[PDB]
Amino acid sequence: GWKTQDPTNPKFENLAHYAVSTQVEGREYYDTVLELLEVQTQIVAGVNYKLKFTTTQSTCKIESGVEYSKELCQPKTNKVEAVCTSIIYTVPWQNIKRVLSYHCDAPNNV
């Protein structure tokens, strides 16, 4: 069902930033996205995006009450710290976006 899409499309990069913004458990800092590696899509009820991207610790402390954004939450260092896959469910005609899954592994080539 999954159709490959162009991972340089900024619409897909912004969905990856949305996904990282939802991940707070066990952290002091938000992660942020370094690179979107892969995007696949499927239409089931809504429009679903399966994103694979690298992350690293951002400079944004979660408990400061800061809103996550790509601009503010820059990487502390340019080092890959995780490779993550996240599925996002959307209903474009209702402006709904929901992270269904988010899982990461450590980079095996650092």
Describe this protein's structure:
This protein has one domain (1-110). It has 110 residues and is mainly beta. 21% of the residues are buried. It has one helix at 10-21, and strands at residues 3-5, 29-44, 46-61, 82-91, 96-105. It has 1 helix and 5 strands. A hairpin with a 1-residue loop joins strand 2 and strand 3. Helix content is 11%, strand content 50%.
Structural class: mainly beta
Number of structurally distinct domains: 1
What's the shape? globular
Strand order of the largest sheet: 1-2-3-4-5
Q: State which percent range the strand residues make up.
A: over 45%
- What percentage of residues falls in helices of 4 or more residues? 10-25%
Q: Characterize the biggest β-sheet.
A: 5 strands, antiparallel
In angstroms, what is the radius of gyration?
14 Å
Calculate the terminal CA-CA distance, rounded to whole Å: 33 Å
Q: If helices are DSSP runs of H or I spanning 4 or more residues, what is the number of helices?
A: 1
Element-by-element helix/strand order: EHEEEE
Would you report the number of β strands?
5
